[PDB]
Amino acid sequence: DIELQKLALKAILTWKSEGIKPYQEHLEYLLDEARFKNELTVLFQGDNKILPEHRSEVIPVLLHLLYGRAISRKGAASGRHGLHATRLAIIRQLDVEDMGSFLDIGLGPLRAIRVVDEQGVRESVFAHEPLPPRKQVGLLNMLEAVINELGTSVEPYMDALVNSVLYCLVNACRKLNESLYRVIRTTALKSLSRLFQNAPDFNWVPYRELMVKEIISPRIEKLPVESTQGVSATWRLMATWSSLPKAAPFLNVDKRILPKIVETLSIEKAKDEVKVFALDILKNLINLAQAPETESQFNELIKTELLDPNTDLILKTIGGVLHGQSDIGRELLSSAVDTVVVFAPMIEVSSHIQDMLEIATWLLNQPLRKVNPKVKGAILLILKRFIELDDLQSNQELQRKVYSTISALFGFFKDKQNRQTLAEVLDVFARREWAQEVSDICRGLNSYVEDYNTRLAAFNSITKTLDQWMPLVHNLLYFIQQPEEFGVLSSNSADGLCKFISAVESVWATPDQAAWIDVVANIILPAIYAGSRDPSETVRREILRVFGFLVSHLPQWELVAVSRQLQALRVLEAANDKREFRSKHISQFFIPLFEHFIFDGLSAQATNTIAALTLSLEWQQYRAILRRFISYVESKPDWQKRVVRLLEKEVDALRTAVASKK
């Protein structure tokens, strides 16, 4: 009460001591209710600081008064800015040495309390109340402010704060009157979650049954069904437990904790963040197991007591998550894939590696909107670690399927380090098998990653067999797609591709006439179709080279300078009208090449060739083709005459087509 505080301060000043004498004006303004926040920063950080000679005289009086001002409910507003910032602005400016007397006036009956004895739990203390459930709430809010304002400097005051917070916590955990005990529980758990990473060197081993009674009794048999919505204070506590190296031995006391924590990951109706939170708890556990000599005191305990009997259920939950739902967030995907990345060099034997390899190749045949390429490189590292377990010999259809994926990601990636690790996962593939052949592919792609002289050496050595050839074809079309370092790489890749298709036309035996011909369709022909739109003229030249080699060597396959350029275009005109053509060839190879011919009598000759080909393609392609050309009209104001000449030629071809089809 402000009036009783004023009269009490008047009596304290009636005690006439020279320690209080120079500070009376600073004292009374704290009880004047309009100047409290200004008088606080007049007292501390002022020219009239408290002198350390009579600091011993003023500080008990001042701290009783500041305590009363922190208690008083009248002048304070609502919300946080009402009185929460007042408590914070007192405690933030108080010294850590005065804070002992501050908590001494804070804890009245709980000053000399003992929670733990030589035995486990003091039930005689716990079956009694010294404070009202109204009164413990302000205590816990104050100690939360004290800890959040102190930080490490709690180290000289460890022996009483933890007894207070533990007493209020276990009285709440016995009382599960609901609301006050519930808020007592939640804010005490927040205070403890701060206090743990406040104090690393304090000894937490004389009590373990208290964490047991705080955890295993109310929650754990229902904990994922509860935590399906949002992160809680128990999870906030287990997080800094997983972060601290001496607190991870609290998770071993009940064996079923980590089962329920990954069962939370198993429940699919969770709102993504409790999932990534449990995922982060697991990240911290595996990082602590991988840490050096500091965490090696309990490394063996977490290795042999926590993760080793629950590897199987961990992989089962991650498998169900990755194969179950049709909608997976990118944050959960990247974080869980990073957990499997860090968890793979921890397991030596396990049970569900067949499943996990099939999961990795499923997530690598996933598209690019669902899975990032950085995430694909992390699943590559997953492949690199999981492949060396002796598993691919049985279930050989799985092993051919993952080899289809390792080959498929060679032309996909654009990063040197990812291609290095790709060469490594193919190396341990080769160590696990056929074996000489995959080792030959290994040395080939190895000196492909290797710099320009070793690269051309690789190209020449490969220049000098189906599953042998397929990864070389994928990395070879990638080495087509590079424009130039000196221009030599695309030429060498084109010559190697010519060697490959020469081997294909060398094999015309019928059960391989199925396989090699399906390969040279599905891998090589859309590669040439997509590389037709490449703006580099040397890349267009080399794709022209391999396509001319294909037409010259193949033909039994059913699906197949200025003046010389004009001459070849006229021969292509005549060849068109003599033989109409294949429509997908016309749509996806010749038109963008001639478009590039225009946009780098060449232009009119090009429009003549497109006006020839528009008769030979089909209207369903022509619809979106014409729409792309009007898109060129509206998007390109740079060559209006050229695009409109092209349009006039195409509509003359349109009227020709309709007049023929009548």
Partner 1 sequence: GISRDSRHKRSHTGAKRAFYRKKRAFELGRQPANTRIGPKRIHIVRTRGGNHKYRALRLDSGNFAWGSEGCTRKTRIIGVVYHPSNNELVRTNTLTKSAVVQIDAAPFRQWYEAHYGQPLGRAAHGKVDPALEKQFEAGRLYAIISSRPGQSGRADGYILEGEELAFYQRKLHK
Which residues in this chain contact partner 1 in the complex, by CB under 8 A? Answer: 38, 41-42, 44-46, 89, 92-93, 148-153, 198
Select from 55, 592, 602, 654 the one that contacts RNA (CB under 7 A).
Answer: 592
Residue pair 133/181 in contact (Cβ under 8 Å)? The answer is yes
601/569 Cα distance (integer angstroms) = 12
Structure tokens at 273: 């963040």
**CB nearer RNA, residue 38 or residue 294:** 38
Q: Which does 228 bind (CB under 5 to 8 A by kind): RNA, partner 1, none?
A: RNA
**CB nearer partner 1, residue 293 or residue 600:** 293
- In the complex, the smallest distance separating the C-beta of residue 139 from RNA, rounded to whole angstroms, is 4
How big is the site for RNA, counted in residues (CB under 7 A)? 87
Residue pair 245/301 in contact (Cβ under 8 Å)? The answer is no
Q: Which does 366 bind (CB under 5 to 8 A by kind): RNA, partner 1, none?
A: none
48 interacts with RNA by CB under 7 A: no
In sequence order, what DSSP letters do the residues of 460-477 get, joined into one string?
HHHH--HHHHHHHHHHHH
- In the complex, the smallest distance separating the C-beta of residue 37 from RNA, rounded to whole angstroms, is 4
Residue that is written with structure tokens 């035996």 in the block: 509
587/530 Cα distance (integer angstroms) = 12
8 interacts with RNA by CB under 7 A: no
Residues from 150 through 189 that contact RNA (CB under 7 A): 177-180, 182-183, 186, 189
Q: Which does 367 bind (CB under 5 to 8 A by kind): partner 1, RNA, none?
A: RNA
Nearest-Å Rg of the Cα atoms of the chain is 38
Q: Look at the alpha carbons of 574, 578, 584, 585 in this order and tell me if their dihedral is positive or negative.
A: negative
Structure tokens at 309: 């009997």
Q: Which stretch binds RNA (CB under 7 A): 54-62, 479-487, 515-523, 620-628?
A: 620-628
Q: Which stretch binds RNA (CB under 7 A): 67-75, 280-288, 399-407, 598-606?
A: 67-75
228 interacts with RNA by CB under 7 A: yes
Residue pair 173/214 in contact (Cβ under 8 Å)? The answer is yes
Distance of CA 314 to the CA centre of its chain: 18
Q: Which stretch binds RNA (CB under 7 A): 27-35, 205-213, 318-326, 553-561?
A: 27-35
Residue pair 472/496 in contact (Cβ under 8 Å)? The answer is yes
**CB nearer partner 1, residue 92 or residue 645:** 92
169/181 Cα distance (integer angstroms) = 9
Task: Output the CA–CA distances (angstroms, integers) from residue 361 to 335, 342, 404, in the order listed.
Answer: 18, 18, 9
Residue pair 520/504 in contact (Cβ under 8 Å)? The answer is yes
**CB nearer RNA, residue 334 or residue 468:** 334
- In the complex, the smallest distance separating the C-beta of residue 193 from RNA, rounded to whole angstroms, is 10
Residues from 406 through 435 that contact RNA (CB under 7 A): 412-415, 418
Q: Which does 139 bind (CB under 5 to 8 A by kind): partner 1, RNA, none?
A: RNA
Q: What number of helices (H) and strands (E) belong to the chain?
A: 35, 0
**CB nearer RNA, residue 175 or residue 570:** 175
**CB nearer RNA, residue 307 or residue 613:** 613
- In the complex, the smallest distance separating the C-beta of residue 245 from partner 1, rounded to whole angstroms, is 13
- In the complex, the smallest distance separating the C-beta of residue 45 from partner 1, rounded to whole angstroms, is 5
- In the complex, the smallest distance separating the C-beta of residue 493 from RNA, rounded to whole angstroms, is 18
Q: Annotate each residue in 75-104 with x if it binds RNA (CB under 7 A) or - if it does not, as one string.
A: xxxxxxxxxxx--xx---------------
Residues from 184 through 203 that contact RNA (CB under 7 A): 186, 189-190
37 interacts with RNA by CB under 7 A: yes
44/50 Cα distance (integer angstroms) = 8
Burial of 600 (0-12, 13-18, 19+ CB in 10 A): exposed
226 interacts with RNA by CB under 7 A: yes
Q: Which does 256 bind (CB under 5 to 8 A by kind): RNA, partner 1, none?
A: none
**CB nearer RNA, residue 456 or residue 626:** 626
- In the complex, the smallest distance separating the C-beta of residue 3 from partner 1, rounded to whole angstroms, is 26
Select from 361, 492, 587, 614 the one that contacts RNA (CB under 7 A).
Answer: 587
Q: Which does 45 bind (CB under 5 to 8 A by kind): RNA, partner 1, none?
A: partner 1
**CB nearer RNA, residue 415 or residue 537:** 415
Q: Which does 625 bind (CB under 5 to 8 A by kind): RNA, partner 1, none?
A: RNA
HEC profile of 413-428:
CCCHHHHHHHHHHHHH
Considering only CA atoms, which of 100, 98, 70 is closest in space to residue 84?
70
Q: Look at the alpha carbons of 39, 41, 43, 48 in this order and tell me if their dihedral is positive or negative.
A: negative
612/70 Cα distance (integer angstroms) = 90
609/620 Cα distance (integer angstroms) = 20
Residues from 504 through 543 that contact RNA (CB under 7 A): 533
- In the complex, the smallest distance separating the C-beta of residue 191 from RNA, rounded to whole angstroms, is 12
Q: Which stretch binds RNA (CB under 7 A): 318-326, 371-379, 474-482, 561-569?
A: 371-379
Task: Output the CA–CA distances (angstroms, integers) from residue 529 to 303, 385, 521, 533, in the order listed.
Answer: 53, 36, 11, 8
Residue pair 73/83 in contact (Cβ under 8 Å)? The answer is yes
Q: Annotate each residue in 329-368 with x if it binds RNA (CB under 7 A) or - if it does not, as one string.
A: -x------------------------------------xx
Give the helix ranges, DSSP H, for 344-465.
353-365, 373-386, 396-408, 416-432, 435-449, 452-463
- In the complex, the smallest distance separating the C-beta of residue 195 from partner 1, rounded to whole angstroms, is 12
Identify the H or E element spanning 646.
helix 640-661
Q: Annotate each residue in 102-141 with x if it binds RNA (CB under 7 A) or - if it does not, as one string.
A: ----xxx-----------------------xxxx-xxx-x
Q: Annotate each residue in 630-659 with x if it binds RNA (CB under 7 A) or - if it does not, as one string.
A: ------------------------------
**CB nearer partner 1, residue 42 or residue 647:** 42
Q: Kindly state the DSSP code that residue 22 receives in the 8-state scheme.
A: G
423/248 Cα distance (integer angstroms) = 38
